[PDB]
Design a binder for this molecule. Structure first.
Ligand SMILES: Nc1ncnc2c1ncn2[C@@H]1O[C@H](COP(=O)(O)OP(=O)(O)NP(=O)(O)O)[C@@H](O)[C@H]1O
Ligand SMILES: [K+]
Ligand SMILES: [K+]
Ligand SMILES: [K+]
Ligand SMILES: [Mg+2]
Ligand SMILES: [Mg+2]
Length: 311
């Protein structure tokens, strides 16, 4: 912290107490959020922000540097060959990928499978030149369970079939049972603390993303209220994915209104990748990518079995 212009040992102590220890956290802060701290003046706040942006070299980039920035994105396999292909390799870090679909389509299964796959080094695809082995070492997941459907037994079973130690996954996966949108958002905001505590959070799951909000802001005369709160939550999720270079996954429910993911416009804009998961015959499922910034729409066929997601 004292490497930052204007920051002395006293100021550093204040910055850490307020949770600002990472250079990126400071480089992307506002004089306001910084001035809310004790003896941190506006000139001081401003100087350290500029310094941090500088140290993190956050300026104009062109040419090959654009490819290099894009190479810092690593991807997590879904265990499905077709889904990984439709995703352009796998689930992208630094982005929010949404899986929406009818009940039983497998949204929660995908979330569990991802927590298991995170513990298999061979399922994290990345360019060694842009992402070092250390950056993805001892990765951990955060599962924010909004409906109470987290199942340790499923994690174990999926792991065993993958040749992974079930307990190992449980030991490296943090679960937070949120009973409402307030807890849901607060937990998401506290993921920073788990990292500050030395936990390499590389996967964040929000299952479900919208169920709490829909139940709390029913009267369509309070819809604006809902969209606003939901928007702050999405922003927090997007920022955390970028700063901590981890993949963020969210599940969403659907309405008839042939259907559409709930959450309205705010969710549509904030989600980087959007899927619609359908049920085929028996254990067959179909994930339809219908929104992404660089990939074409496509469908991936897979199955949900005792082994989890496969094919
Ligand atoms: N151990 C298992 N063996 C085989 N199939 C399983 C197993 N566990 C779950 N499934 C399948 O997973 C389906 C449910 O998956 P689930 O992830 O809960 O869907 P969902 O989209 O999250 N549902 P919802 O949250 O209500 O909208 C089941 O109905 C089973 O067919
Ligand atoms: K300094
Ligand atoms: K259900
Ligand atoms: K459910
Ligand atoms: Mg991003
Ligand atoms: Mg579910």
């Amino acid at each position: 912290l004292t490497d930052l212009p204007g920051v002395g040992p006293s100021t550093a102590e204040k910055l850490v107490e307020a949770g600002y220890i990472d250079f990126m956290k400071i480089a992307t802060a506002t004089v306001g959020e910084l001035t809310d701290i004790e003896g941190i003046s506006e000139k001081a706040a401003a100087k350290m922000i500029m310094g941090a942006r500088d140290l993190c070299d956050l300026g104009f980039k062109s040419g090959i540097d654009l490819l290099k920035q894009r190479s810092t994105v690593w991807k997590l396999s879904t265990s499905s060959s077709e889904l990984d292909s439709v995703l352009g390799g796998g689930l992208e870090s630094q982005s929010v990928t949404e899986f929406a679909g009818v009940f039983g389509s497998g949204k929660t299964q995908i979330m569990h499978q991802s927590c298991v796959n995170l513990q298999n080094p061979e399922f994290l695809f990345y360019d060694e030149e842009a992402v070092s082995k250390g950056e993805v070492a001892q990765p951990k997941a955060v599962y924010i369970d909004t409906e109470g459907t987290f199942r340790p037994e499923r994690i174990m079973q999926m792991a065993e079939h993958a040749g992974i130690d079930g307990q190992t996954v449980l030991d490296n996966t943090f679960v937070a049972r949120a009973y409402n949108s307030d807890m849901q958002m607060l937990f998401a905001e506290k993921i920073e603390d788990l990292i500050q505590e030395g936990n390499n959070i590389k996967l964040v799951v929000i299952d479900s993303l919208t169920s709490t909000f829909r139940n709390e802001y029913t009267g369509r005369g309070k819809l604006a209220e809902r969209q606003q709160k939901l928007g702050r939550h999405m922003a927090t999720l997007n920022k955390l994915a970028d700063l901590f270079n981890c993949v963020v996954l969210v599940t969403n429910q659907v309405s008839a209104k042939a259907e559409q993911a709930i959450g309205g416009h705010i969710v549509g804009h904030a989600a980087t990748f959007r899927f619609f998961v359908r049920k085929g015959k028996g254990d067959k499922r179909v994930a339809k990518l219908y929104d992404s910034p660089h990939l074409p729409d496509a469908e991936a066929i897979f199955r949900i079995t005792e082994k989890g997601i496969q094919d």
